[PDB]
Design a protein around this ligand. Structure first.
Ligand code: MG
Ligand code: ZN
Ligand code: ZN
Ligand code: ZN
Lengths: 255, 66, 95, 34, 528, 95, 44, 521, 115
DNA sequence: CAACGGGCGGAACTATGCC
RNA sequence: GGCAUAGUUC
């Protein structure tokens, strides 16, 4: 009637990728962590645009939508910030948002590429990930002009998918089909998984009636906003705070 | 119209790869080799570059109002 | 001067006939526009090809329960001059 | 000088030349011109 | 003229007295929603806030109605008007003075439509009385008319751009009329053919067969979930069938909990042979056919279209006739929810692997086709040598055509039988055909083996050109290919002549569909 | 005014006699998609008013008229579209 | 009120009760200039 | 025939027919005959040669073209009633060759048999694996898809216009789309479609859409509408004032400028005033134009000019971005149409081993009865093409493209040959027992949305002659309660509901009558 | 037009309570917990943890409608044990497991980089 | 036997020309 | 405001 004793092993760790193996954990817990990677990890992204001049070939909502999807490095200040709905300011203060400014005009005979290199922020720690190519925003002819002011709030991927900090979360358990959770009409047509521990002749592991899914394999790839280790840690802390607040509310209700 | 910033299916950023992709193609690369070189690993990301039609080049031909 | 005749777009007597794509873009006209329509009071009109029975040929048909057994008509026209058609029938009474 | 089993490109070269010469709305233009 | 004013449709009598435009009506797109009950309809918040119902003030509700008036026309659970006893109207869409907001018994408040309101839902054309039934309103976020899926059959409605009409009765008298007369659960069994007019539709129906196979053993947690989705559940988990070495339930053991009351029924699965009922194993049924329900428990058998469908004497029909509309409604809802949430575990699909046959089957099909073409050639040779003898009552052309068509039909049917009997136990075409969800053995045959002969006006493809079908054939060619017998299946593809002949064949179906409708409507109007 | 009116309304004839004038020529160009524009510019019409014969797909439409593209409803088989390589003669004189 | 000419792209003042003509190019199609009022776009 | 082939005396347009049995020669110079080009076969060998092919493939900087091919006597124009005296061959290198002799006197040959299809039916991939009604339905629905309809849409004031954000050219395309320019102005997006029954919201031709994909710009579009008004008493463009004009409404006039026109970039909600115009009543009457109810668009462009006569003229355009909701209509290139049923986020959609959630989920019951196997083959070919890097060829009659070849090609990239893939459940994380068929198919967003179709009424405007509710969603009209509906209510027996629908809900009235003569008094 | 704002799926509004406790009168020692603004991310963990308890006889959860954000959990336990105690113990055990997992992942990161 | 007259689906949504 | 015509959905 007690908790488990999970263990981890990090197979590969780079600047955009973490591969690890969780063991001695329940499938529900593993999948809940997998879901929290995608949805409930706070990220800084642009959420308020005011276009002073737009003589380009894309309309204002098009440009604003493109601006929203440029990822900003929120490695360290995403914890410090507050939600704009949770702040004492009127609309925006430095404690709950980061302000951006873009002002580009083309006066040459060559098409100019307005990229994320041109977004300028007041805080030096929240900058587009392509500022230590570039994310193209719009192209300008001669005489066309763009100028705007934007504000970067804080949020997570349940609200909008621009706050989703990951690129592809590969989740897989039981690479050899020893638990028969999926049934193959022909087992020999199916390619073996990357983590399979079988020979070149045997296709499926023999059935294991007294087994449960353990040893989940992950691969969390980051979209550049957070680094792929803080995505995992923020998910374990982020899920842990959801359970704690549930326990607080239950204790009030019982009493 | 213009290449999207993110891949629709998974969210990997493909909005900074169109110029590099065109340059690789101009440098005598096959499309498969160019996509492999740019790091587009899964077909959801690969189709974003394979099937893109860049109309903003055509839209830039017409003179602006001002 | 006896009147004004509408002109079909991209035809030999339009202002866009023979122009290159750069000139078309200068005139704010799409180089991909196929043409072949009229501009009447702003709106764009398209004539629809209308099928008709071939003229100057003898066709022999039959009618279900009419007086005649077999009929034959020759819808006759003269080189698109005038007198549009004159369908002469040479029938044959039933038995 | 036959074109054997290389036909799947020859036929489409011919068709491309056709559509480069004429187009798709040639009927309307030719009828109005005449 | 006045006679023209009164003459026909759009004319006064028949266009403004026998049928006229009404108030309190809405029309928008319908989309599926398997989480609703049989007699519920999902309504967007905009339509509800736009349509109103007049409620008379009494001491039982004066506080609630006063709060609604305080909310006003802006907030959705509000009201739009206050109608005095004298009849004079008070507006609430703008800001009124505090004096008019006073409410006393005998007043009327025109509140916005809320949950539980009774409405009449219709899809045009209205053919039988199961096209206008009463539903209970539930308010849902987005802007389409959500409605359940078993109610698709009464309306003949699929969810591809369709629309339906909403009518809101305005008086307690008519509301009670619709509640006691035209509610959806009360129209389950039609008086046209004394059969249930609605049944399980194709997705719970393609999955209840798989659920009710013998192999389905359910773990403890899966049983917990499925029971969590049961609305008519006592609260006691039944003893598992397999008790050692691991507790396992069974799909029948849970469909028994779904089945209401003490219903006794005996049906037969759609793949039940003609020897089980005769030889031994009559009551043992090796293939698990011969559905038996005793005391409301599914003892044996596999459930399909012939048990849960819209046919006479089916399980749903027995449930209605024995228990009533109020229990048959729960029967439908529970079947749908439990089977859908189990299907989230098993899954379903359809693909090329399900539409591809085996090499031996391909050899059989090609052999049969070659034999049929040879036989047609032989018949043509005998006819040319004048050795063919006419059949009494038929012309020489008629007997030749009859022999040719008979040979080709035999070929098509034999290839179809080979394709059917060469399927597998995991094939999804077989899954959707055996359970009766959607498709047929002829469709499987056309996908795998042979599309078959194309006919125009009941005869073979005619001679459009001078004595030949197309410019690619010689004159006077009566072979199977010349007159349009497609030897290929849809998976292999059609050669250009077969493509054109198939288009000629499908044009007739499109024409008949576009033609029959007006005549059918006119016949029904004359009868009425 | 005569040419402008006939092209604007579609009633092919004089304004005073728009009763027997055949309506349905000179439609307003479809601009929803480029394919819509092209298939509108290459379109035929059979002036037949319910008989199946003029609505069926005759054998002689091979390579001249699309076997598939047709509207559904009250004009199934009466509105047709040219095949891809089909051409329509412009006319000459047999001198 | 300032309207931008559709041919020479030159803005010129035109008031009410005034033929819509363009100086120095003689065109007849004029476009209104973009407003100075500020409008806020979510970046969704 | 020799003279027509040389193009010396008889133009290539003229047709010549010999009726051998009836001894008649018919020559037509008429206008209106319909004809198509055909290759010429002299003995058994095409007159088209490799020299012609090379001179054609060097077409640039060589002034050798189709006219120079026709003038060489290689191809020919054949009208319909000259086709009755000709022997055609569908494919040269297959029908001219030595066989068991069917015909050894071929007189012509087909260029390619796939040129029998029109403009809208040349975009269907693998049409020979489909069903003819499905091909017809796709031919119908190809004129309703939303993409960029013309490149100069920014200077066109068209009454209604719809343009997609990010169109894509198909990954599986027909060879004859290069002539239709579908590569340059496409209409649709390649979507990762999984054919599965997930939660029951795609039953009966419905579609489950990924909401996270939609948040990234998937199938998003714009809607442009144009309004016009001219000042034909004395109508004048001017800003009305509440306490000086006779006619007035409950709308806002504070958006307008001095001359009565909204400047571009001004957000206008439903039931606002765009153009303010006033009639001097012989003291001023308001005839302002109002936004069509519930648009919530932004003014895009305002054009001021003079009409034919000389009155001032104005056209104003309004744009509104349309994000795909749960009522919008989508369709593939195989006659499979459906409406969005519900939208799930990325965390809820089922995923593969590699984190590839489908963009669209469609029901497996749509396939067996409709027999659109071109859909499955297009999905498989797209899954091969997106990995290989090429763009698949789906021209109708090929003989060099088989399902077996496609499957073998797909097996070389690590996937199951027949296209299936093991998916995991989204909510619970457990493997789904049945493997799902998933791959990139080319989908279209049809013109039919739900925001342009939702309509309701409760005591609105009323007609003048009959005093019944108006007709038309734009006029807040009611829904007709026809004779079939009243017959259904008669069959029900709901007499009071029927009387309410036909009398009280519609026009009620009262009159007086004399008890002696039945005449209104 | 009828589009709910995105934040309504996780933000409690004025008046809404996070969790409400109701008893089940069909079977003794049964209780239903209704949680507002939650989904499978919490329902699945709580159910799977309740099933580990040997004194829990029933433990399930369901989402009554995907368009309305609300979670219902039903747990029945053996006598001399209450479902509220089972629920609280489940949450405590989940928190302990997550804390241990985070500690071990952090030490694994430390070992992997610079080690 | 011939001539004359009335009869021929149901809903719904856009657009354009004209009085 | 009304009359007419055209297209489209089911
Ligand atoms: Mg339908
Ligand atoms: Zn703040
Ligand atoms: Zn991707
Ligand atoms: Zn100018």
């Amino acid at each position: 009637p007690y908790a488990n004793q999970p263990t981890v092993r990090i197979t590969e760790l780079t600047d955009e990728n973490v591969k690890f193996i969780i063991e001695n954990t329940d499938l529900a817990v593993a999948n809940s962590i997998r879901r929290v990677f995608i949805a409930e990890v706070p990220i800084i992204a642009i959420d308020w645009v005011q276009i002073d001049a737009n003589s380009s070939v894309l309309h204002d909502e098009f440009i604003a939508h493109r601006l929203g999807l440029i990822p900003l490095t929120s490695d360290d200040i995403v914890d410090k910030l507050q939600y704009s709905r949770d702040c004492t300011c009127e609309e925006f203060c430095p404690e709950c948002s980061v302000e951006f400014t873009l002002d580009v005009r083309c006066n040459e005979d060559q098409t100019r590429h307005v990229t994320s290199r041109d977004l300028i922020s007041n805080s030096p720690r929240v900058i587009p990930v392509t500022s230590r190519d570039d994310i193209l925003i719009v192209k300008l002819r001669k005489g066309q002009e763009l100028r705007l002011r934007a504000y970067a709030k804080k949020g997570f991927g349940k609200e909008h998918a621009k706050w989703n900090p990951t690129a592809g979360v590969a989740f897989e358990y039981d690479p050899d089909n020893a638990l028969r959770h999926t049934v193959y009409p022909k087992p020999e047509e199916w390619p073996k998984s990357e983590y399979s521990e079988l020979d070149e002749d045997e296709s499926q592991a023999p059935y294991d009636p007294n087994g449960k899914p353990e040893r989940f394999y992950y691969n969390v790839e980051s979209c550049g906003s957070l680094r792929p280790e803080t995505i995992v840690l923020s998910a374990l802390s982020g899920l842990k705070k959801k359970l704690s607040d549930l326990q607080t509310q239950l204790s009030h209700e019982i009493q | 119209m213009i290449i999207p910033v993110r891949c629709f299916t998974c969210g990997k950023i493909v909005g900074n790869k169109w110029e590099a992709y065109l340059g690789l193609l101009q440098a005598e690369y096959t499309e498969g080799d160019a996509l492999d070189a740019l790091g587009l690993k899964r077909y959801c990301c690969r189709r974003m570059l394979l099937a893109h039609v860049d109309l903003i080049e055509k839209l830039l031909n017409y003179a602006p109002l001002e | 001067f006896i009147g004004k005749i509408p002109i079909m777009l991209r035809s030999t007597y339009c202002l866009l006939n023979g122009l290159t794509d750069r000139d078309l873009c200068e005139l704010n006209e799409c180089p991909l526009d196929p043409g072949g329509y009229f501009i009447i009071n702003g709106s764009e009109k398209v004539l629809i090809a209308q099928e008709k029975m071939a003229t100057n040929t003898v066709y022999v048909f039959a009618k279900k329960d009419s007086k005649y057994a077999y009929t034959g008509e020759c819808r006759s026209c003269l080189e698109n001059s005038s007198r549009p058609t004159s369908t002469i029938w040479v029938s044959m009474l039933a038995r | 000088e036959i074109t054997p089993d290389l036909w799947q490109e020859a036929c489409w070269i011919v068709i491309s030349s056709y559509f480069d010469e004429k187009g798709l709305v040639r009927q309307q233009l030719d009828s109005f011109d005449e | 003229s006045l006679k023209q004013r009164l003459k026909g449709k759009e004319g006064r009598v028949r266009g403004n007295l026998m049928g006229k435009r009404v108030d309190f009506s809405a029309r928008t797109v319908i989309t599926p929603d398997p989480n609703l009950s049989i007699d519920q309809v999902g309504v967007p918040r905009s339509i509800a806030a736009n349509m109103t119902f007049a409620e008379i003030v009494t001491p039982f509700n004066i506080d609630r109605l006063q709060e609604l008036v305080r909310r006003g026309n802006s907030q959705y659970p509000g009201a739009k008007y206050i109608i005095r006893d004298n009849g004079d109207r008070i507006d609430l869409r703008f800001h009124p003075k505090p004096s008019d907001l006073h409410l006393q018994t005998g007043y009327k408040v025109e509140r916005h439509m809320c949950d539980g309101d009774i409405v009449i839902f219709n899809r045009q054309p209205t053919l039988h009385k199961m096209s206008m039934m009463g539903h209970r309103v539930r308010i849902l976020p987005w802007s389409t008319f959500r409605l359940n899926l078993s109610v698709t059959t009464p309306y003949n409605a699929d969810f591809d751009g369709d629309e339906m009409n909403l009518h809101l009765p305005q008086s307690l008298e008519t509301r009670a009329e619709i509640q006691e007369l035209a509610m959806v659960p009360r129209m389950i069994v039609t008086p046209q053919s004394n059969r249930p007019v609605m049944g399980i539709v194709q997705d719970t129906l393609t999955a209840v067969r798989k659920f009710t196979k013998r192999d389905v053993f359910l773990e403890r947690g899966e049983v917990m979930n499925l029971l969590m989705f049961l609305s008519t559940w006592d609260g006691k988990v039944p003893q598992p069938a397999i008790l050692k070495p691991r507790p396992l339930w069974t799909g029948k053991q849970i469909f028994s909990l779904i089945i209401p009351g003490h219903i006794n029924c005996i049906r037969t699965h759609s793949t039940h042979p003609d020897d089980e009922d005769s030889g031994p194993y009559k009551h043992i049924s090796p293939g698990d056919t011969k559905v038996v329900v005793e005391n409301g428990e599914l003892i044996m058998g596999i459930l399909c279209k012939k048990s849960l469908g819209t046919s006479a004497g089916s399980l749903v029909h027995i449930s209605y006739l024995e228990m009533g509309h109020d229990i048959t409604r729960l029967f439908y809802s529970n079947i749908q929810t439990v089977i859908n949430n189990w299907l989230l575990i098993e899954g379903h699909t359809i693909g090329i692997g399900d539409s591809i046959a085996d090499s031996k089957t391909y050899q059989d099909i090609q052999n049969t086709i070659k034999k049929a073409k040879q036989d047609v050639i032989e018949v043509i040779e005998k006819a040319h040598n004048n050795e063919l003898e006419p059949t009494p009552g038929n012309t020489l052309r008629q007997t030749f055509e009859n022999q040719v068509n008979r040979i080709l039909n035999d070929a098509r049917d034999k290839t179809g039988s080979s394709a059917q009997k060469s399927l597998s136990e995991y094939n999804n075409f077989k899954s959707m055909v055996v359970s009766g969800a959607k498709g047929s053995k002829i469709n499987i045959s056309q996908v795998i083996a042979v599309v078959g002969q194309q006919n125009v006006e009941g005869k073979r493809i005619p001679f459009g050109f001078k004595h030949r079908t197309l410019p690619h054939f010689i004159k006077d060619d009566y072979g199977p290919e010349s007159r349009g017998f497609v030897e290929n299946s849809y998976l292999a593809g059609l050669t250009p002549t077969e493509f054109f002949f198939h288009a000629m064949g499908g044009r007739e179906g499109l024409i008949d569909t576009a033609v029959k409708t007006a005549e059918t409507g006119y016949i029904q109007r004359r009868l009425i | 005014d005569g040419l402008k009116y006939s092209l604007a309304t579609g009633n092919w004839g004089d304004q005073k006699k728009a009763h027997q004038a055949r309506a349905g020529v000179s439609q307003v160009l479809n601009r929803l998609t480029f394919a819509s524009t092209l298939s509108h510019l290459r379109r035929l019409n059979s002036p037949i008013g319910k008989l199946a014969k003029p609505r069926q797909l005759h054998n002689t439409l091979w390579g001249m008229v699309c076997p598939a593209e047709t509207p559904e409803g009250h004009a199934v088989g009466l509105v047709k579209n040219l095949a891809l390589m089909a051409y329509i003669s412009v006319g000459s004189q047999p001198s | 009120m300032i309207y931008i000419c559709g041919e020479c792209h030159t803005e010129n003042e035109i008031k009410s009760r005034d033929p819509i003509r363009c100086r120095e190019c003689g065109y007849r199609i004029m476009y209104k200039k973009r407003t100075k009022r500020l409008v806020v776009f979510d970046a969704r | 025939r020799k003279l027509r082939r040389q193009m010396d005396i008889i133009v290539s347009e003229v047709s010549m027919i010999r009726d051998i049995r009836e001894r008649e020669i018919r020559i037509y110079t008429d206008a209106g005959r319909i004809c198509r080009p055909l290759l010429i076969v002299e003995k058994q060998k095409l007159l088209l040669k490799k020299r012609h092919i090379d001179q054609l493939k060097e077409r640039e900087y060589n002034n050798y073209s189709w006219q120079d091919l026709v003038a060489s006597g290689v191809v020919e124009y054949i009208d319909t009633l000259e086709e009755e005296t000709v022997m055609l061959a569908m494919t040269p290198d297959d029908l001219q060759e030595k066989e068991v002799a069917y015909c050894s006197t071929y007189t012509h040959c087909e260029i390619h048999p796939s040129m029998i299809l029109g403009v809208c039916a040349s975009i269907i991939p693998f049409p020979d694996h489909n069903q003819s009604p499905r091909n017809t339905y796709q031919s119908a629905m190809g004129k309703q898809a939303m993409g960029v309809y013309i490149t100069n849409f920014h200077v066109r004031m068209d009454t209604l216009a719809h343009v997609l954000y990010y169109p894509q050219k198909p990954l599986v395309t027909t060879r004859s789309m290069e002539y239709l320019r579908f590569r340059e102005l496409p209409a649709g997006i390649n979507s990762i479609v999984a054919i599965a029954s997930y939660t029951g919201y795609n039953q009966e031709d419905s579609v489950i859409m990924n909401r996270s994909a939609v948040d990234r710009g998937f199938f998003r579009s714009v809607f442009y509408r144009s309004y016009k008004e001219q000042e034909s008493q004395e109508e004048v463009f001017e800003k009305p004032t509440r306490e000086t004009c006779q006619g007035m409404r409950h709308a806002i006039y504070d958006k307008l400028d001095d001359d009565g026109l909204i400047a571009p970039g001004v957000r206008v909600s439903g039931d606002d005033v765009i153009i303010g115009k006033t009639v001097t009543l012989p003291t001023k009457r308001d005839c302002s134009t109002f936004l069509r109810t519930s648009e919530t668009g932004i003014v895009d462009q305002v054009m001021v000019t003079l009409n034919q006569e000389g009155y001032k003229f104005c056209k104003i355009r309004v744009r509104s971005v349309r994000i795909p909701q749960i009522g919008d209509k989508f369709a593939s290139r195989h006659g499979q149409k459906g409406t969005c049923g519900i939208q799930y986020r990325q965390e809820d959609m089922p995923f593969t081993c590699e984190g590839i959630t489908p963009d669209i989920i469609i029901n497996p019951h749509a396939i067996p009865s409709r027999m659109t196997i071109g859909h499955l083959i297009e999905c498989l070919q797209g899954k091969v093409s997106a990995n290989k890097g090429e763009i698949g060829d789906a021209t109708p009659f090929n003989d060099a493209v088989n399902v077996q070849k496609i499957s073998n090609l797909l097996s070389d990239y690590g996937y199951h040959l027949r296209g299936n893939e093991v998916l995991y459940n989204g909510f619970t994380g457990r493997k789904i027992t049945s493997q799902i068929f998933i791959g990139p198919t080319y989908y279209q967003r049809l013109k039919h949305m739900v925001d342009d179709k939702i309509h309701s009424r409760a005591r609105g405007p009323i007609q003048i002659l009959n005093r019944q509710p108006m007709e038309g969603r734009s006029r807040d009209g009611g829904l007709r309660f026809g004779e079939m509906e009243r017959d259904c209510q008669i069959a029900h027996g709901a007499a009071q509901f029927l009387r309410e629908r036909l009398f009280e809900a519609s026009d009620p009235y009262q009159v007086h009558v004399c008890n002696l003569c039945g005449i209104m008094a | 037009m009828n589009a709910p704002p995105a934040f309504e799926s996780f933000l409690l509004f004025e008046g809404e309570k996070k969790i409400t406790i109701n008893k089940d009168t069909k079977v003794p020692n049964a209780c239903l917990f209704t949680i507002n603004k939650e989904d499978h991310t919490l329902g699945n963990i709580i159910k799977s943890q309740l099933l580990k308890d040997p004194q829990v006889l029933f433990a399930g959860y369901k989402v009554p409608h995907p368009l309305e954000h609300k979670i219902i959990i039903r747990v029945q336990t053996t006598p001399d044990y209450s479902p509220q105690e089972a629920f609280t113990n489940a949450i405590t055990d989940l928190i302990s497991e997550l804390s241990l997992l985070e500690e071990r992942f952090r030490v694994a990161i430390k070992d992997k980089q610079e080690g």
